[PDB]
Amino acid sequence: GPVPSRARVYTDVNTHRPSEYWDYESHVVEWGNQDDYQLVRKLGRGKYSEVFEAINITNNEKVVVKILKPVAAAKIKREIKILENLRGGPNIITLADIVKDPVSRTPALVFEHVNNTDFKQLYQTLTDYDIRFYMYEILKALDYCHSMGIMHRDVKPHNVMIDHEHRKLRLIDWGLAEFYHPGQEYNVRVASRYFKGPELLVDYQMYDYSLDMWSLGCMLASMIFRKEPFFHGHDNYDQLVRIAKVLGTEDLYDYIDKYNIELDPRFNDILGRHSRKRWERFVHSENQHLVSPEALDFLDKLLRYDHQSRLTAREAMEHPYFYTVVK
Numbered sequence: 498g499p500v501p502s503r504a505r506v507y508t509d510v511n512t513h514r515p516s517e518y519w520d521y522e523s524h525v526v527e528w529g530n531q532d533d534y535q536l537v538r539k540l541g542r543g544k545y546s547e548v549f550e551a552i553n554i555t556n557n558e559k560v561v562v563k564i565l566k567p568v569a570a571a572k573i574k575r576e577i578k579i580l581e582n583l584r585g586g587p588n589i590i591t592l593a594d595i596v597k598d599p600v601s602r603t604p605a606l607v608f609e610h611v612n613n614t615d616f617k618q619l620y621q622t623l624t625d626y627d628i629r630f631y632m633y634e635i636l637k638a639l640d641y642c643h644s645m646g647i648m649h650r651d652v653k654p655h656n657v658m659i660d661h662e663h664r665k666l667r668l669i670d671w672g673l674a675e676f677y678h679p680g681q682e683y684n685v686r687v688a689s690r691y692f693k694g695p696e697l698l699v700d701y702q703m704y705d706y707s708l709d710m711w712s713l714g715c716m717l718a719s720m721i722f723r724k725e726p727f728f729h730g731h732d733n734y735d736q737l738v739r740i741a742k743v744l745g746t747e748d749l750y751d752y753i754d755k756y757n758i759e760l761d762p763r764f765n766d767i768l769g770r771h772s773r774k775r776w777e778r779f780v781h782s783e784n785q786h787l788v789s790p791e792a793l794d795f796l797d798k799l800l801r802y803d804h805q806s807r808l809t810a811r812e813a814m815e816h817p818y819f820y821t822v823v824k
C-alpha cells in the first residue's frame with residue numbers, strides 16, 4: 498500500500514509534551530458568564546457556526562462571538578484545546594472566553610475583535626512591500642502553531658484578519674486544526690478547494706504541517722499574479738488538473754510513485770500530459786509591480802507536489818523575498 502511519511506520538523510512535539518496538551522477529549526472546559534456579552538450584529542454564518550460582533554459589558558470592548566452549530570458541537574473540545582494551547586502566540590487570534598449560548602444551548606467562543614480591512618480592498622491595493630510584510634506575519638503564526646504540534650489545515654484569505662491601519666494580522670478559524678502525530682492518517686476532506694494540497698487531492702492521508710505551506714503558496718500566487726484563485730478547479734478532480742497544467746504531470750507521477758499512491762482511475766481521461774511552466778509565463782503588465790526573481794523563487798519552493806520538499810515556515814522566513822521587510 499502507500500509508503501508512510503512523517504514531517505521533517507516538529508515530529509516529536511506532541512510526545513514530548515504531557516498528554517493533557519494534545520488529549521483534547523480529556524479537557525474540562527472552564528465556562529464563563531454569557532451575560533458579560535451583548536450581541537450587536539450578525540457578521541456571518543457558515544455550515545459550522547454563526548458569528549456575531551458583540552460588546553463585553555465588563556470593559557466595553559468589542560469582541561466576536563462564534564456560536565457553534567450542533568454539527569461543530571461534537572469536535573468543539575479540539576478547537577478549544579488548540580486555541581488555549583496557542584493563546585498568546587504571534588499573530589494567533591486570542592480566545593477571550595467560552596460560554597454556553599442561552600438560545601442555541603451550544604458553546605459560544607468569544608474572541609478578541611480585529612477591525613478587518615475589506616478583502617477586495619486588501620487584494621486590490623496591497624503593494625509589493627505590503628505583500629512581503631504580511632506574508633512574514635502569516636509565517637510567524639504558522640511556524641508558531643507547527644512548533645506547537647498543530648496544523649491549521651484551512652489557510653486561506655478569509656481566515657486571515659488584517660487590520661491594515663495598525664499593520665496587525667491574525668490567523669483565525671481553528672475549527673479544522675489538528676494535532677500532528679507521526680504516522681497518523683488524517684481526513685483529506687480539509688481546506689477550501691482552491692487551497693487543497695496535492696496530498697489531499699490524491700487521497701494521501703499521512704500528511705503534516707507542510708499542507709499549510711501549499712495553501713500559503715496558493716495565496717501568494719493569486720496575490721502576485723493577480724489571478725484569483727490561482728488554481729481554479731471546477732471540482733476536486735479538476736483542481737489537480739489545474740495544478741498539473743502549471744507544475745507538469747511528470748513531477749506528479751514521480752510524487753505518486755515515491756509514496757506508492759494509485760491515482761483514482763477517473764484521472765486517466767482528464768489529466769493529460771503537461772510540462773512544467775516557468776513562473777515568468779504568468780507575468781504581465783498588470784502584475785509586474787508585484788513580481789520579482791525572489792518572489793518567483795519563494796513561490797517555486799512552496800508549490801511543490803512532494804509535501805516533504807516544500808519550505809517549512811521557519812525556512813520560508815529565511816528567504817531572500819523577505820530581506821526588504823523591516824524587522
Ligand SMILES: Nc1ncnc2c1ncn2[C@@H]1O[C@H](COP(=O)(O)OP(=O)(O)OP(=O)(O)O)[C@@H](O)[C@H]1O
Binds near residue numbers: 548610613
Ligand atoms: N476575531 C474576529 N474579529 C473580527 N471579525 C471576525 C473575527 N472572527 C471572524 N470574523 C468575521 O466573522 C464573519 C463570519 O463570516 P463567515 O462565517 O461566513 O466566514 P467567511 O469569512 O465568509 O469565511 P468562508 O470563506 O469560510 O465563508 C467574517 O466576515 C469574518 O471576517
Ligand SMILES: COc1ccc(C)cc1-c1ccc(CN)cc1Cl
Binds near residue numbers: 656
Ligand atoms: C490572497 O490574499 C492574500 C495573499 C497574500 C497576503 C500576504 C495576504 C492576503 C490577504 C489575506 C487576508 C485578507 C482579508 N481577509 C486579504 C488578503 Cl488580500
